Amino acid sequence: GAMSGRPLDVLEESLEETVTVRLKDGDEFTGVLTGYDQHMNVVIEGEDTTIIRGDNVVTIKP
Amino acid sequence: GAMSGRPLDVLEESLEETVTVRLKDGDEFTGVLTGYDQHMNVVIEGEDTTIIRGDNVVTIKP
Amino acid sequence: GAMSGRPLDVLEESLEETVTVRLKDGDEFTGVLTGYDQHMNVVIEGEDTTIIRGDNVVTIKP
Amino acid sequence: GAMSGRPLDVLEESLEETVTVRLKDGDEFTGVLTGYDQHMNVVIEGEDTTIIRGDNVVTIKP
Amino acid sequence: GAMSGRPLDVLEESLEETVTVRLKDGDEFTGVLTGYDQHMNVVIEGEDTTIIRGDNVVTIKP
Amino acid sequence: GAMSGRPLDVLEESLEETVTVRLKDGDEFTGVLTGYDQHMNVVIEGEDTTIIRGDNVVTIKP
Amino acid sequence: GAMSGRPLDVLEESLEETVTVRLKDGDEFTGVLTGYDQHMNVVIEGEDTTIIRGDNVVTIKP
Ligand SMILES: O=c1ccn([C@@H]2O[C@H](CO)[C@@H](O)[C@H]2O)c(=O)[nH]1
Ligand SMILES: O=c1ccn([C@@H]2O[C@H](CO)[C@@H](O)[C@H]2O)c(=O)[nH]1
Ligand SMILES: O=c1ccn([C@@H]2O[C@H](CO)[C@@H](O)[C@H]2O)c(=O)[nH]1
Ligand SMILES: O=c1ccn([C@@H]2O[C@H](CO)[C@@H](O)[C@H]2O)c(=O)[nH]1
Ligand SMILES: O=c1ccn([C@@H]2O[C@H](CO)[C@@H](O)[C@H]2O)c(=O)[nH]1
Ligand SMILES: O=c1ccn([C@@H]2O[C@H](CO)[C@@H](O)[C@H]2O)c(=O)[nH]1
Ligand SMILES: O=c1ccn([C@@H]2O[C@H](CO)[C@@H](O)[C@H]2O)c(=O)[nH]1
Ligand SMILES: [Ca+2]
Ligand SMILES: [Ca+2]
Ligand SMILES: [Ca+2]
Ligand SMILES: [Ca+2]
Ligand SMILES: [Ca+2]
Ligand SMILES: [Ca+2]
Ligand SMILES: [Ca+2]
Ligand SMILES: [Ca+2]
Ligand SMILES: [Ca+2]
Ligand SMILES: [Ca+2]
Ligand SMILES: [Ca+2]
């Protein structure tokens, strides 16, 4: 198809795996990716759950 | 389905439980989550009711 | 139903009550909430009338 | 109805009357409001005519 | 009508006339308004053509 | 018609010609405009090819 | 057709080819373009997979 492996599809394929999320402020969050949505909001599970709002995200290393 | 546990579905299951919202300006708001919407606007209940506009949120930890 | 006490619904129930609105620039406005819209634009009646563009809002405390 | 006196409805009742618009960069513009739109762009007429793009607006005092 | 003299309608009444556009970075552009769109992108003609993206616009003064 | 010579229409008629794009960070890119889209993403080809995301654009000079 | 070589179409033609993405914070990512979407989110394959959110992108140079 078009668009190759879409970014949200790569996120779909990274469910239940450890990703690292880097935010515009410099902070990094590492933990299991348990959910995401169309805005690139992500749920990251480490010692506890973190919902990260997508507009803060610079990169995700899945 | 697709998307694991969507971020807004994790909010739904955090309703009436305690969460911490961290904003872009550095402020943190702890209290009971009593509502949310599509924009990730949140209602946090401490001694006061605090409506937080979604665009200010960095992370929500339930 | 879903989303608990939706943020805008709490606004609806805060009409004609005193609220405090804090802006990104750190200013605060206290007065009677006489209107709002789906952007979280709000009308605050103090000594005189203030319309606040929602995109400046950080928190609203009803 | 809902939302009380909507922010855009207050601007509707302030057409042909004097208002003060304050901008995110701190400038204020005073004059007769002669038009507006759903983005809250406004037309302010004092000695000059000024179209103000709504995303710059913090407050409007009708 | 509603909304008085809508800001984009003022732009229409300014086509083929000289206006002054002030940007968020402080620069000012004076020239013939030869076009605009619904985002308030404008084409300003001085000694040459300048297309200005609307999200940089603070004010337009016909 | 309305809106005069629309900005995207000026971009159409500047295809295959040389233009200067100035970004919010202050950088400038000069080259032949070989494409654009509704967001004002542009493709500029001088000695190499640069896709510029429209949200960074201040002005384009065709 | 209209719009010449659309920016997203240049991206399509760059799949499985090395490109270089520059971000607003100054960082640069070089690697194989393996995916993209309509927001200009991109997936860049270097030593690791990196998902880049579009709104941080300034330029992409294939
Ligand atoms: O839940 C949401 C909704 C929107 N946005 C993004 O953030 C921008 C500004 O808040 C929006 O335009 C959208 O791209 C999010 O990150 N999360
Ligand atoms: O009530 C609202 C309406 C919009 N937004 C978000 O704020 C962004 C711009 O301020 C919008 O794109 C949207 O994501 C909110 O947070 N709350
Ligand atoms: O009257 C309006 C119209 C829109 N916005 C919203 O402000 C954000 C940034 O301008 C966008 O979400 C936009 O929809 C307002 O705050 N007020
Ligand atoms: O003519 C326009 C078009 C859009 N916007 C608003 O500007 C913000 C983005 O620049 C969004 O809230 C958008 O609705 C305006 O203020 N005026
Ligand atoms: O590829 C894209 C997708 C979206 N946007 C911008 O994102 C904002 C969405 O309202 C607008 O400024 C739009 O031009 C871009 O610049 N490029
Ligand atoms: O071609 C353009 C010019 C301006 N914008 C504005 O940039 C904002 C991005 O926040 C949008 O909401 C819109 O108002 C576009 O989307 N596209
Ligand atoms: O996954 C997403 C979702 C939204 N946006 C951006 O958020 C804004 C929504 O108006 C636009 O700039 C759009 O390109 C992204 O960059 N990536
Ligand atoms: Ca996997
Ligand atoms: Ca799978
Ligand atoms: Ca009054
Ligand atoms: Ca009414
Ligand atoms: Ca009146
Ligand atoms: Ca009329
Ligand atoms: Ca005229
Ligand atoms: Ca003039
Ligand atoms: Ca020319
Ligand atoms: Ca031509
Ligand atoms: Ca080429």
Nearest CA-CA partner of C59 in C15, C31, C26: C26
Query: Which phi-psi region, left, alpha or beta, contains residue E53 (left: φ > 0; alpha: ψ -120 to 50)?
Result: beta
Cα A18 off chain centre by: 10
Query: Beta strands A18-23 and D18-23: pairing type?
Result: unpaired
- Please name the method used to determine this structure: X-ray
Token digits of residue G15: 């799949």
Token digits of residue E33: 């308004």
Nearest CA-CA partner of C52 in C34, D47, A39: C34
Whether the CB of E38 is below 8 Å from some CB of chain D: the reply is: no
The 3-state DSSP composition of chain F as helix, strand, coil percent (nearest 5) reads: 15, 45, 35
Nearest CA-CA partner of C40 in F1, E18, A45, B55: B55
For residue F15, the ligand closest to its alpha carbon is 17
Q: Do G40 and F35 touch (CB under 8 A)?
A: no
Nearest CA-CA partner of G45 in G56, G35, G54: G35
Q: What is the DSSP string of G8-57?
A: HHHHHHTTTSEEEEEETTS-EEEEEEEEE-TT--EEEESSSEEEE-GGGE
In degrees and rounded to multiples of 5, residue C13 shows phi and psi of -75, -10
Whole-angstrom Cα distance, residue E15 to residue D26? 30
Whole-angstrom Cα distance, residue E3 to residue E26? 29
Whole-angstrom Cα distance, residue B19 to residue B36? 12
Please tell me if the CB atom of residue B54 comes closer than 6 angstroms to any atom of ligand 2: yes
Of C36, C48, C53, the CB nearest to D57: C53
Q: Is D18 annotated as a binding residue?
A: yes
In degrees and rounded to multiples of 5, residue D22 shows phi and psi of -110, 135
The ligand 2 atom at the shortest distance from the C-alpha of residue A55 is 14
Q: CB-based contacts of E48: which residues, under 8 Å, 6+ apart? A: F61
Cα B52 off chain centre by: 8
